[PDB]
Symmetry: D2
Subunit: 340 residues, 4 copies
């Protein structure tokens, strides 16, 4: 049974052995609170690589200390992070899986003690601290921080880099009018609201020419917020800037009610894919190979991102292969076990 | 867990208790070869009604003897067929399931001994008898047969009627230029090739004002045949004539290779749905409630047609309800067994 | 994958195509309240035959009106019941499934309005009417009713007969000292409490030489009641009298707490099987083919009785066959659907 | 839903959080060929600990170099192995799982280049090297090797120790007449054939008073070989010697045909359990919580050992808990994922 799910996919120079991607998920397991890779990560990620996941994307990694979501996040603001990250990379690549990292900045949604920054001094909600309005210098510092991150990620041996522009974090906050009330050239206009992201992408492409992903929130789920069609122009923009694939998520810019169901974000992925003629990754309640195969075969997305499902079963690819009657390469150690 | 799969759907004033539809499937179980409903059908269909299927479409029923696919098909060319059909109707509606029937004519794909008819004297393949080219009288005679069938179906107490215009059968043969080489008013142009279907729809609507489906073959899978885009104008046409929902299938006008996979015909259904602005039914390798829910929630179709799965498990709705964590009314006899 | 679950089993000369048995389950669907077979039964049972169940035991059928559990039960106290039962027999055997019937008498647990009878004038609980203490004439009259029932069952064309001596009903009430306080030849000792059952078996065998099952309640779940060990001598007794297989259930002689779990009654079945050297049927939360195969291969039982599972899925045998990678004959109509 | 599967079990002073045990499975992943713990093991085992397995038993670890099955086996013949083992122990215990190790000696089935030892100079088969007949000194050396192993295992922080007396390896070879043709006090008699094992157990108990398991092969599957009843006396013996639980497997003493099916070795486990009044572990095609729960509830074994299933899904406990409606403690990191 020849399937698309387990067919190779080539981005730039990198060739993934299948279409299965481990969606970036924070583990909050940096007990040392210095952003260092810990034992938990060294067991957590390689498990999925053994599980035959084609691409494993490391959780949101703060490019600055105040850029972290929490004090237990992975970091990459120092050359000291390279060693631990390099070790992690080796542990993953070892099993035939490609490894990526999600460069992130939590913006006004950072729960790190102290000052937090954002496009405008507007709180996420009435329970969150008011962020500092970023100055011009702040913006350029942060852009430089992202570039430094990409540099270290490449240094560590990462195959793919993703820019976290979603889930209501810093970049997302520049994108949405809900959070961006600036009146300089970084706000008050679709083009202006895109500027920050545009700079981040340029800065990264300046030190990184390998696969580049950008994760977006296709919708704010708010009458005065962004919708999928607002991200078509942005996607075409990202394509022009050398972005290889758009990881299409949604929401979290502000507290909002969201109807959730199997593949509730797939239409966002197909929309961007077809309207902007750019590869996309589908994420959101993808739990079966049957479902993943339909997503791929019907051209709704090129890569399938799994979140919670890969937390429940690190070897999901095996079960999916069984479900689809496909055959994959089991680790020699598990040959007799993965066998029918 | 509030789901769309197990939400009611009203069509023309008929309320289906859910979105699950039993796709019309030939049983070839008329041992008497007279098109009469037999014990098999009386056990086969009601079983799915007990299974809590919302709508059960009875297999292809020949409006004329030579219109049957085989001599073991159900027939409706005689008022004598009513009694048996009415009994079947009661057996099904008894459990809260709506019942439909598929009015059919095999055309050049008929395997019943004797003369077979078609738009043009062109055989389906080198293993099929060459059909007689239909005269005007033949065409009007067949249109009348479709009306007689609808009339009898109404008297039997059917809730829904579907016109079989797909799978390369008679009507499909008029629609496709691959099989229709006529140079009169019934061929040579889009509206001419549609004429036969249009007349059938009108003839039926003259005696039937209930929910009316039309099953189409969205693609001929042939370079010189029809594709989805060809059926958008047709679907709009059908909407104007009072067609309530398009049951979107594909293929079988000529021998052709099909790439089959989960939901391989869903895009056809959504295409027609959104471009023709008409309710559609998705069919083709729909096997899980998870999959079915995605199709509905994402507006790809309004009803989900199940074929093979409903032959494997007549109580599929129960399994799907469990899968989705939905709650449905079990038959009072099975309450202690269906108890989650 | 050669399995024991889907291996034939011959009992007295009757060959069952597999080891799957539909456990007798009351449907309370005799709306006419005359014990007549109704449309429900004619759809309910044959569905499992199409499902490829090897043996289908019809629900508890009252040998006398007051012997019914409720007025909506099947009856067999009249020659008028034969016609309907014979029709049901044909509907089932039509698909290669053997059909059995459970001859029953509710005793003090009868809920039909009027006088109810029992070994002693002791109510099931404080919510049940106190039974009339049976006279010798009553006992012989009831034994004759069981024979009449067997005679009619034979004429209807049944393949297997099961005597309901379990679930705290009439016969069970004679067996258990909790309900049998008689001081005549029918109580006061092990063989005396067995006497009624022994007579019923003899009466039945006088008109029936086919496969004969006896359903027992292996345990009363009461400090002063019977336990499995008490039924070993009884099972040996039954073997001597020509009983072919013991269907081993438990409980319900009085209100009692039961610890229920997968195969919670299997040990009872294996106990009887190995100590009395007699074929047994295992029943009670048997839900998977995996589980069923273990029961058979490990010699815990010879037949597997399914209850609730067969109400949830009439085609369970198909699912179980897939689970075990076994091959079974699909109904010719469903061949393309059951295709693995 | 309160289950036995996820109920604590206490051995000596150790308390397992559930009845789920990871059966010892060779990984052949010691690339350095020095028996050292490698990166593979450090990822392999902790994964199951994260998966909420209650007891994880490390693969067969050779107590001597020639005692290894292969050159890629884990070893424990040197104090140098302690460091790596201690690290492994920490990585496992970290997640609430108890960790054990299987002390092993491959005997005549060793595939290590060079001399191999056995009770008698008889080959496993015509494709295997002829083993050296062990002298008295050889036997005492090997017994001392086992004691040294236990010492180091305790030193490393292991919770449980298992002695590998099965699968036709050294100890098993002393047990079975098929392989043991000695005429000294170590052969020619059930008592004599047990002597080697008896000494090994004593030697271990001399430096270890924590939980002690012994894995046996209940049957040789050969007319002239051992059967389950031969191991009853041995089990009672092991109980007398302070053995806490008998891990009941079977076969592999010589090439033999073996009928395999769900729980094909459970009867061996129950036999030893009830006849010798000693806790046992059941292993062999246990793949579902439903099945595991029946094994526990019916007193067939006290602990459930999973092999291949735990290779296919390291987080099996989660799926089993779901299957049984039980609730367990998910790692905080996976809380949102293991959640319904
Ligand atoms: C525990 C957890 C942590 C997450 N952290 C991240 C993250 O760091 N970066 C990100 O892009 N998405 C994050 N998300 C979202 C997931 O990556 C995923 O896209 C989302 O949960 C939906 O995917 P799923 O339905 O397959 O779980 C997280 C989700 C979960 C449950
Ligand atoms: C045995 C069988 C008979 C069928 N007969 C008909 C038919 O009479 N009319 C029709 O429109 N489709 C017929 N089909 C196609 C089914 O309606 C259904 O669309 C097709 O099998 C694919 O759906 P599925 O993947 O859910 O099985 C038949 C299919 C099968 C397997
Ligand atoms: C609705 C229902 C009706 C039943 N009626 C009978 C009956 O008439 N005779 C009988 O022996 N057992 C009867 N039982 C018990 C079943 O035969 C079966 O042994 C029990 O439900 C447990 O089996 P299971 O776990 O496979 O469902 C009935 C059970 C149910 C759920
Ligand atoms: C790859 C593999 C390695 C094994 N190595 C060992 C071992 O080192 N020690 C042992 O006692 N059993 C070993 N066995 C047997 C397993 O521990 C297990 O008891 C057997 O495979 C049956 O269990 P299962 O059906 O759950 O897989 C091994 C089995 C497999 C498949």
């Amino acid at each position: 049974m020849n399937t698309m799910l387990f067919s190779p996919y080539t981005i730039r120079g990198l060739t993934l052995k299948n279409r299965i991607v481990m969606s970036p998920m924070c583990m909050y397991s940096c007990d040392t609170k210095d952003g260092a890779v810990r034992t938990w990560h060294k067991i957590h990620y390689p498990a999925r690589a053994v599980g035959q996941v084609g691409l494993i994307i490391v959780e949101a990694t703060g490019v600055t200390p105040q850029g972290r979501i929490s004090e237990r996040d992975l970091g990459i603001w120092s050359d000291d992070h390279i060693a631990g990250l390099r070790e992690l990379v080796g542990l993953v690549k070892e099993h035939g899986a490609a490894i990526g990292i999600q460069l992130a900045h939590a913006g006004r949604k950072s729960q790190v003690p102290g000052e937090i920054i954002a496009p405008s001094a507007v709180p996420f909600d009435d329970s969150s601290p008011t962020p500092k309005e970023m100055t011009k210098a702040d913006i350029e510092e942060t852009v430089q921080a992202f570039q430094n991150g990409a540099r270290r990620a490449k240094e560590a041996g990462f195959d793919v880099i993703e820019i976290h522009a979603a889930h209501g974090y810093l970049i997302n906050e520049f994108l949405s009018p809900l959070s961006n009330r600036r009146q300089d050239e970084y706000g008050g206009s679709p083009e202006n609201r895109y500027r920050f992201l545009g700079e981040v992408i340029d800065a990264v492409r300046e030190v990184w020419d390998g696969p580049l992903f950008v994760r977006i929130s296709a919708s704010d789920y708010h009458p005065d917020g962004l919708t999928a069609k607002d991200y078509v122009p942005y996607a075409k923009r990202m394509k022009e800037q050398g972005v290889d694939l758009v990881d299409v998520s949604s929401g979290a810019i502000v507290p909002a009610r969201m109807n959730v169901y199997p593949g509730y974000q797939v239409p966002f992925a197909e929309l961007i894919r077809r309207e902007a003629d750019i590869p996309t990754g589908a994420v959101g309640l993808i739990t079966s190979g049957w479902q993943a195969e339909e997503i791929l075969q019907n051209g709704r997305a090129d890569l399938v991102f799994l979140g919670r499902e890969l937390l429940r079963n690190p070897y999901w690819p095996y079960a999916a292969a069984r479900e689809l009657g496909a055959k994959i390469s089991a680790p020699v150690q598990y040959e007799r076990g993965w066998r029918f």
